[PDB]
Write a protein that binds this ligand. Structure first.
Ligand SMILES: NS(=O)(=O)c1c(F)c(F)c(S(=O)(=O)CCO)c(NC2CCCCCCC2)c1F
Ligand SMILES: NS(=O)(=O)c1c(F)c(F)c(S(=O)(=O)CCO)c(NC2CCCCCCC2)c1F
Ligand SMILES: [Zn+2]
Ligand SMILES: [Zn+2]
Lengths: 261, 260
């Protein structure tokens, strides 16, 4: 059992999960000193993001986040191997401190962060297997701020109130995930990192888009209040909040940008 | 041992020291949402900070920072118990990313940070005994930014070449420690936290001053380049850099300010 608050909190993850205390840890603060423009950085292409509306995809509160499972036929192109979708999830903060992105940009926490997890399907038979292996994962990160209502994100946020507790499962009608991407996806930060949750394997190529998306005050509140980290039967409920890991040292590492300034 | 890097860096500190994976950990990001003004916070009074120019004080490279020993006559007034000085020390980054303050303000790392450690000498016989007890410590933080040369800080820095390796020591003549403090010291952040290094006891009354000081770029480069974590006879040597902890979750606590 690992949490984001307390003695089983992030500082103690290394105890049972050695990689959490290891190399190439994520997330990071995105700031000019570690940034380098790289003009070999080409736009990604997104394939099979348009999931059938006439089909439904499994949403899961896993006691640590709310995740939507995704079909392996959805993949990205523009990286070295094929990367096929496995899942998306979010991290966020709390109504007292609604700044719970994981990556930060010149020290600024955004409101929340959306992650779309892909695995290496040129090399590995699944995501689980790929996760423990080198260059085995690729994560897309969309920074989220407060602003206008977001009908596309609502396509997820409306099933929340019905997966409130640990282990619970429910169904979203398939939709076009590219709707969850920001403006100018060609402009992004790229670097080598790790899973931000136990077991923290250093196996992730991160792409964090330069531009954020906007969801409204109420959707943001909704996301921050809907879920619990605990089961239905648990005598000591815990609200699912602050489910972002703190930024990590970035020693001898560099973040590559597809954009100049 | 414990380091700021590698498999013995900060995310593994809790495997050696229970408190570093506990509550109320320092340092923290100083940002708008969690600041609460508190008109109750009166200016501290610094007693016995004008050290005798006629006395030498030990400056030690301990493999983690450079620390100057301070006399137990040196104390803070203004708090509920008397707090007496034990030492001061610093934290910093590296020439390639010269942002190594422990506290950040609105997410921004300053160049470096100066810490002046005190223990509660109304309750306890010394610092080490006080290190694990209620209301044990009060630490003063001074945020450091790169800029104008600072004569006073050079009263410490000018000696850096003498404490280059771990276990190495210089002697420093007394000057006024208050000269190290930024202006308007009445203006500060205040919160309950911990030691930023192992054993990380959650026994520190923190006071971070609002205003940064400046040191020159030469002065900061000396601090970033003179010192080593390893002994002189270590020919597999570690540079002393990035000797600061990442900011901690701080999300039931508030930080109180004395200014608006
Ligand atoms: N920010 S993250 O992208 O590194 C991340 C999470 F934050 C996260 F919580 C998870 S998971 O524990 O919720 C479970 C995945 O469905 C994964 N998942 C990865 C690691 C777990 C191995 C199997 C799935 C591969 C991705 C994950 F990748
Ligand atoms: N950031 S800090 O102000 O809490 C701090 C340090 F960063 C630090 F490095 C030290 S250290 O020089 O002694 C090396 C760490 O072992 C102390 N020293 C205090 C805490 C040590 C235990 C009890 C005595 C109080 C001094 C210390 F207090
Ligand atoms: Zn994630
Ligand atoms: Zn310190």
């Amino acid at each position: 059992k690992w949490t984001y608050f307390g003695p089983d909190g992030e500082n103690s993850w290394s105890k049972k999960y050695p990689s959490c205390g290891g190399l190439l840890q994520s997330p990071i603060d995105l700031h000019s000193d570690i940034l380098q423009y790289d003009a070999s950085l080409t736009p990604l292409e997104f394939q099979g993001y348009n999931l059938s509306a006439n089909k439904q995809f499994l949403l899961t509160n896993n006691g640590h986040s709310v995740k939507l499972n995704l079909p392996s036929d959805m993949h990205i192109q523009g990286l070295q191997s094929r990367y096929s979708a496995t899942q998306l999830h979010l991290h966020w903060g709390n109504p007292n401190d609604p700044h719970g992105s994981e990556h930060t940009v010149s020290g600024q926490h955004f409101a929340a962060e959306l992650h779309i997890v892909h695995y290496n399907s040129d090399l590995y038979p699944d995501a689980s297997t790929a996760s423990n292996k080198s260059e085995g994962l690729a994560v897309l990160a969309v920074l989220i701020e407060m602003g206008s209502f977001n009908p596309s994100y609502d396509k997820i946020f409306s099933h929340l109130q019905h997966v409130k507790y640990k282990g619970q499962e429910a169904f979203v009608p398939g939709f076009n995930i590219e709707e969850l991407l920001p403006e100018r996806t060609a402009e992004y930060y790229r670097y080598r990192g790790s899973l931000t949750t136990p077991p923290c394997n250093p196996t992730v190529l991160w792409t964090v888009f330069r531009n954020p998306v906007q969801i409204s005050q109420e959707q943001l509140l909704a996301l921050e209040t809907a879920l619990y980290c605990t089961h239905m039967d648990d005598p000591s409920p815990r609200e699912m909040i602050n489910n972002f890991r703190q930024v990590q040292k970035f020693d001898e590492r560099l973040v590559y940008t597809s954009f100049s300034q």
